[PDB]
Design a protein around this nucleic acid. Sequence first.
RNA 1: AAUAUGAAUUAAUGCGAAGUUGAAAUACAGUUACCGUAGGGGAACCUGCGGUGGGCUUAUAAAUAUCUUAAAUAUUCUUACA
RNA 2: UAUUUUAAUAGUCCUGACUAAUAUUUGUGCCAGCAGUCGCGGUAACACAAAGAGGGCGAGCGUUAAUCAUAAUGGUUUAAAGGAUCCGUAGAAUGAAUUAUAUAUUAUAAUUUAGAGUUAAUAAAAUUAAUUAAAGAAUUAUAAUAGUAAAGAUGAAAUAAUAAUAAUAAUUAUAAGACUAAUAUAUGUGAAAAUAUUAAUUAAAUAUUAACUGACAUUGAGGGAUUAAAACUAGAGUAGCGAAACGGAUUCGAUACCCGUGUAGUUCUAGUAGUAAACUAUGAAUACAAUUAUUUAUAAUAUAUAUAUAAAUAAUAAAUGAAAAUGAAAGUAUUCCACCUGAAGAGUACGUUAGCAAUAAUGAAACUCAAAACAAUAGACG
RNA 3: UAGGUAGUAGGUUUAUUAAGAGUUAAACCUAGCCAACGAUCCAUAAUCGAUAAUGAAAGUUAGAACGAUCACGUUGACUCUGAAAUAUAGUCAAUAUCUAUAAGAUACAGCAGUGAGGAAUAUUGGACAAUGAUCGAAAGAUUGAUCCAGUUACUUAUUAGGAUG
Lengths: 319, 154, 125, 102, 32
Amino acid sequence: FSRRRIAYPFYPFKKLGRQHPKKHDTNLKTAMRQFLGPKNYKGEYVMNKYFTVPTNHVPNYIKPDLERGQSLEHPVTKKPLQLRYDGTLGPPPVENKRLQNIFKDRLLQPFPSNPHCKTNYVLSPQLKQSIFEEITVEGLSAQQVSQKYGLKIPRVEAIVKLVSVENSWNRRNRVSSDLKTMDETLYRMFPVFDSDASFKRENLSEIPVPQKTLASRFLTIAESEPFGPVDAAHVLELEPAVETLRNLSTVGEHSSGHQQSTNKNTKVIYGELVEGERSQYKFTNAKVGKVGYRYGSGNRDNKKDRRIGFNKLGQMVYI
Amino acid sequence: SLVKLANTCAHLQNCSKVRVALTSIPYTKLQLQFAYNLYQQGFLSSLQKGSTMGPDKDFVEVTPDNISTRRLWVGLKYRDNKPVLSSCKLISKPNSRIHLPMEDMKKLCSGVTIRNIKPLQPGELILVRAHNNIMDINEAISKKLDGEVLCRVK
Amino acid sequence: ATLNQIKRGSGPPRRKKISTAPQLDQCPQRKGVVLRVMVLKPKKPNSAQRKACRVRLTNGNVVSAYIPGEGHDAQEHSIVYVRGGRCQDLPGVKYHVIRGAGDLSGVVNRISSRSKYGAKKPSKS
Amino acid sequence: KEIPRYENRTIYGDIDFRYHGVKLHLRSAKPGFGLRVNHVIFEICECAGIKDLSGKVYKSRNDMNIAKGTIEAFTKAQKTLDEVALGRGKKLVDVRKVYYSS
Amino acid sequence: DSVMRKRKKKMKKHKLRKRRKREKAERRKLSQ
RNA sequence: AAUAUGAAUUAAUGCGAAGUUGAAAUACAGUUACCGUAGGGGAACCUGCGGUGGGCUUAUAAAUAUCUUAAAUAUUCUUACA
RNA sequence: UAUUUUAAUAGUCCUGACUAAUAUUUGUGCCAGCAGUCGCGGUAACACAAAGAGGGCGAGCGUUAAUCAUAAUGGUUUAAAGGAUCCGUAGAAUGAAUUAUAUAUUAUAAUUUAGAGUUAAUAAAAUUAAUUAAAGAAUUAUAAUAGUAAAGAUGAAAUAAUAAUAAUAAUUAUAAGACUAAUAUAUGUGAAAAUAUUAAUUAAAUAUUAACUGACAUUGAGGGAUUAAAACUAGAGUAGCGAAACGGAUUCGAUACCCGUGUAGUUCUAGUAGUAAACUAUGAAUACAAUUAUUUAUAAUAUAUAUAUAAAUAAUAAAUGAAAAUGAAAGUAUUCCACCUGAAGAGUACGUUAGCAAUAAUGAAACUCAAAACAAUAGACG
RNA sequence: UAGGUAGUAGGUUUAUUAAGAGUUAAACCUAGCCAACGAUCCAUAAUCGAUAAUGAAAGUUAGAACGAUCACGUUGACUCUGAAAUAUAGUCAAUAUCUAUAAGAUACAGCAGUGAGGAAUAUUGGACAAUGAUCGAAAGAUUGAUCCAGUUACUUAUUAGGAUG
Ligand SMILES: [Mg+2]
Ligand SMILES: [Mg+2]
Ligand SMILES: [Mg+2]
Ligand SMILES: [Mg+2]
Ligand SMILES: [Mg+2]
Ligand SMILES: [Mg+2]
Ligand SMILES: [Mg+2]
Ligand SMILES: [Mg+2]
Ligand SMILES: [Mg+2]
Ligand SMILES: [Mg+2]
Ligand SMILES: [Mg+2]
Ligand SMILES: [Mg+2]
Ligand SMILES: [Mg+2]
Ligand SMILES: [Mg+2]
Ligand SMILES: [Mg+2]
Ligand SMILES: [Mg+2]
Ligand SMILES: [Mg+2]
Ligand SMILES: [Mg+2]
Ligand SMILES: [Mg+2]
Ligand SMILES: [Mg+2]
Ligand SMILES: [Mg+2]
Ligand SMILES: [Mg+2]
Ligand SMILES: [Mg+2]
Ligand SMILES: [Mg+2]
Ligand SMILES: [Mg+2]
Ligand SMILES: [Mg+2]
Ligand SMILES: [Mg+2]
Ligand SMILES: [Mg+2]
Ligand SMILES: [Mg+2]
Ligand SMILES: [Mg+2]
Ligand SMILES: [Mg+2]
Ligand SMILES: [Mg+2]
Ligand SMILES: [Mg+2]
Ligand SMILES: [Mg+2]
Ligand SMILES: [Mg+2]
Ligand SMILES: [Mg+2]
Ligand SMILES: [Mg+2]
Ligand SMILES: [Mg+2]
Ligand SMILES: [Mg+2]
Ligand SMILES: [Mg+2]
Ligand SMILES: [Mg+2]
Ligand SMILES: [Mg+2]
Ligand SMILES: [Mg+2]
Ligand SMILES: [Mg+2]
Ligand SMILES: [Mg+2]
Ligand SMILES: [Mg+2]
Ligand SMILES: [Mg+2]
Ligand SMILES: [Mg+2]
Ligand SMILES: [Mg+2]
Ligand SMILES: [Mg+2]
Ligand SMILES: [Mg+2]
Ligand SMILES: [Mg+2]
Ligand SMILES: [Mg+2]
Ligand SMILES: [Mg+2]
Ligand SMILES: [Mg+2]
Ligand SMILES: [Mg+2]
Ligand SMILES: [Mg+2]
Ligand SMILES: [Mg+2]
Ligand SMILES: [Mg+2]
Ligand SMILES: [Mg+2]
């Protein structure tokens, strides 16, 4: 049974009834007015608890289920307010116990209907500075920094690169007071990342799932026969999982055991340059049958899957 | 002989359904190898030589004078009111023999379909006849040998 | 069926796809001349006075067509463009005339589903 | 009833069970495959806790017969690994589980 | 089949028999 | 020689309501229906010879009955006589 | 103490279900009309034509014409569909055991006997086909003896036969055609069609044992033979039954059902044709699977009918099935052949082949439709 | 479409070609060869991909576009050059048009364009600037190949205003 249903709030609200013919209002509009509260001369809905932004490092996300739609609170006393018969506002007759105690997971969950989404932790400026120094000044490996602080190798590389950008923007004295206000405001909006705490730390034993390990296999062997992860690797013809974890640990730019000297054995000739020439030629050896444009290739220009790419300057080029 | 093998497969099916404990199948090298592979993999309680009337307790020498009256005697198992040997059926029929290369055997065990042969299910084994020897498909892959897929027994 | 019979031809029957517009000769539409305009009675249980036109296509085969809409200017020696489609109630007619093509004008004062019947969009801007 | 599920996600192996005039062909699925089955079976699975499956219904497609057949197939057509191992006297190992183990 | 289609076929056979009986003269003339 | 296009007047067949003439089938359909075949009749149909049940399996009485301790004993007995 | 100006007008289809679209209202009233399928409209139109509101796609939207996909991880007792039956050729169809070689699921050689056959001995049967030779009771016709006025049929009468010899009925004599009573279950035999009055000649058929052979086997396109009743061509016969025909009946009519006369046919010899509800509506073969009851055959343990093995029948377990039901299969499997792909058109038209002929075999397409069909359930009806 | 074939199947020699071959010409023999797993005959069609569409896939469809192959340049036959032509050559035969009336010339399946046919498919455009091709010692000359632009929503892609209200 499917029917068009106007998205009336699930929580109860006062519904307009006998009204002057020259009002032309709707139950949805009055629901919003009840939820927002009065709009002052400045255009600010001070009553609504979500108008402001938290400064206590605890996110203030919507909890419609727990507060039964009562989104109005005193700006200073931070106590619930609800509409009465007289049309004024004041303390509720009873206290809502669900709002009293909220699990930390719910605190970090922004959307009520999706319990699989959580907001990451903002790293403190001190931690970023320490990571920068240890990578650069102390000349350590990003693997070590990841292991101590629990962050990922891409994250620590991003930390160092962003800190370098911040330093460059700083020695030019370009960052204005507005950006500092922005950072201060947003810094207190999300929880800080405590390397000491285990449950904030991010797991570093994460491996992409190969397509073959997602396919179920079963072997019937002597019960006594011991079967281990290495035998599984042999039968699945994949590198052992621990070995794959070790391999990805060395792919970081600052991680130990990294080398990208594979493509240093191709004959490349740079043509001579004379005065007045606006260009120079590079000649790279390429074996016949492996170089050139195919004859009779596919023409996807007029099809939905046409290839579209970008050049160095960023212009959209039909690759 | 694929006809005899198909007959034995149907016979084992029927006996398991009516839930008998002892059964007789012809005397042949193919049947003996097939039964003993089943016995190793755990589908038969006991395999025994014997005549048409019953298994032979003592050693007996098989001669042309008594070759006709020889039948292997197999013992089926049951557990938790469910026969262990539920279904057993041929793959390579007598009219359409199937000879798969080793790579196709590996593909079959992996999960893909080759020659409209359903892949290897859990608790299943495909017997393969290579060089006059019957063995599990995994053993053939490990041994690198090649041959015809014979039957599935679940 | 034995596999010997399958190799001899036996197998699943290919789903027959009979054309519902044979006289169009695999063409979206064809011109024609209205040899006659007739009103026919629908088969039971429907009852009406349906307007149909007998049209001779350019191939050289005469087909029956149904003029849709409310009010048509079809008449003898009228050039019309016949398309596919069948008027289900009338038994025998298996084609439609495209309103707005040829000398067959569109439906007058048609304001909904115009393109299906032929009508310029009134601007009123 | 109680339905045995492989890793609380999918059935064990493939099922080709027949209910009266309904030919149920069901085959297991990869993690994250989704219920790519007929709507009747999809509802039965979603209520029973099965998340990944794939199959096709042949011959009769009566909804009620399909629902009865699929429930029965889950109940008795399939067999758990432990039961096979015990009645077989052999050891069945999940390569996927033992590849990602410690 | 049932007696429905059996009745239908019987009538068709009877009509064919009568039609071929009436056209005996024409058949003879056309076949010399 | 093959093929295609017409051809006076004429044989089937489909389609829409639609009246006329009977009542051939479905019940024992008022003569059991149908298969093969021959003859007859405005039309269904009727008749003749064999075959089938896709109708009778729908099947449901001629009938006769006996002796051992009738209890001071079996009938009671709730873990002990044995 | 600045460093040009500056905006933004989407169409198209649909909102009963399949199919997303509830905010209601007006016009017509089986008309106008819509429609891919079901279908809507005859005063409740959510379906026609519109307003409000809404749902898709979007510089495109719709419609037409087309391609792919959407079920054979199928069927043939009762729904489409096993050939009438068997014999057998090809089969690039299938098919025993052990060992040794190779180029390996195949071949070659040797050996073996479980499939398949040949011959003897022992025991039981008088069935099937052909050809001869006989028996039985009747029915009709004719004649005689007596013997009367009615006899025959029907729900009841008349058509045809009686006191003109004089019937009908009874008892005798003669001729003819046809058929086969219990037995009797077509039991049974036979490849099917068929097959029961008796005897004879020829041919075939069962079980056990001995020996022999050595996979020589199964199925079988094409092909070949036989094939009920009716039908046709010659020649004999025609008692009784009996298409057609002619009369008598009932009915409003009666080209019928009932009655009379009754030609072809029905009968034998030689032929043609090869068709049936030719049905177990169920092709043949092989291996296997749980019980019961009754008959038949074999085996000496016997003491004088208990014990084991085969086949048929009947009722079932499991299994299968849409169910009714099948239950040495319509179950579990393998091999071979025939056939089916919606109804109507249509086993029709045309062509070809064969027949003396009636006809038999082969065998389309066009137009129309969303129908058509089986099992079972509950009523109503007889 | 149930029988077909008569240089037909084969053998021996000679003749042309660089060459075998009843491929062609000549002589003598044998009596064969294809065929119900479909001959001979008839009708239809340009063929294919590492191309396009679709499907989970085996497959099914198209052969527009990119590429590969074949055949043709109004129709049929023959001839010289060559290694190769039955050549868009020529001869001859056939058809239609034109002027020069002649063993005359042309045949838009080269580009642009016109009439018809059709539901339907474009400019009688610019340059040899780039890549090629031809001639020339070279300077250079030509190139409707080719590179560009115009018509067309035929197809694909991007954009076609955000915050606040
Ligand atoms: Mg809806
Ligand atoms: Mg349904
Ligand atoms: Mg049938
Ligand atoms: Mg005819
Ligand atoms: Mg004539
Ligand atoms: Mg005419
Ligand atoms: Mg009647
Ligand atoms: Mg009747
Ligand atoms: Mg009559
Ligand atoms: Mg019969
Ligand atoms: Mg009846
Ligand atoms: Mg009955
Ligand atoms: Mg019965
Ligand atoms: Mg409309
Ligand atoms: Mg109204
Ligand atoms: Mg609609
Ligand atoms: Mg409307
Ligand atoms: Mg509107
Ligand atoms: Mg809109
Ligand atoms: Mg398919
Ligand atoms: Mg069968
Ligand atoms: Mg039969
Ligand atoms: Mg039949
Ligand atoms: Mg024998
Ligand atoms: Mg008398
Ligand atoms: Mg008798
Ligand atoms: Mg019998
Ligand atoms: Mg038989
Ligand atoms: Mg041998
Ligand atoms: Mg045979
Ligand atoms: Mg035959
Ligand atoms: Mg008879
Ligand atoms: Mg005669
Ligand atoms: Mg009579
Ligand atoms: Mg009579
Ligand atoms: Mg004959
Ligand atoms: Mg027949
Ligand atoms: Mg049962
Ligand atoms: Mg079955
Ligand atoms: Mg069936
Ligand atoms: Mg016929
Ligand atoms: Mg309808
Ligand atoms: Mg019924
Ligand atoms: Mg009643
Ligand atoms: Mg030669
Ligand atoms: Mg020659
Ligand atoms: Mg010659
Ligand atoms: Mg042919
Ligand atoms: Mg062509
Ligand atoms: Mg192709
Ligand atoms: Mg093609
Ligand atoms: Mg091309
Ligand atoms: Mg040429
Ligand atoms: Mg031309
Ligand atoms: Mg030429
Ligand atoms: Mg020329
Ligand atoms: Mg041109
Ligand atoms: Mg166009
Ligand atoms: Mg150039
Ligand atoms: Mg676009």
